[PDB]
């Protein structure tokens, strides 16, 4: 399903949308990005709530 749908048609999307979209990164131009800064945490609840 990745071959038929995802590999074929998005390569057709990349074939068409090539000279329209332009995306570079902060690390491509600087490397001053400190970390993969996104982290996650968990919390609890109270039994009355």
């Amino acid at each position: 399903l990745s071959e038929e749908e995802t590999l074929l048609v998005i390569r057709r999307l990349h074939k068409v949308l090539r000279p329209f979209l332009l995306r570079r990164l902060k690390k491509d131009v600087e490397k001053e990005l400190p970390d993969k800064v996104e982290k996650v945490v968990k919390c609890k609840m109270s039994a009355l709530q």
């Binding site: 400190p34 970390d35 982290k39 945490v41 968990k42 609890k44």
Partner: protein, 38 residues
């Protein structure tokens, strides 16, 4: 995909806001009131 299918102590909360070994020590002064609590 494995994520598809605690931290009450100070140290795991210290691990977030530190990003280094230096800030790990300065959050121990907040361990005598929050965790110890007289």
């Amino acid at each position: 995909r494995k994520k598809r299918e605690e931290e009450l102590k100070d140290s795991e909360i210290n691990e977030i806001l530190a990003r280094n070994d230096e800030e790990m020590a300065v959050l121990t002064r907040m361990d005598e009131d929050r965790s110890k609590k007289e």
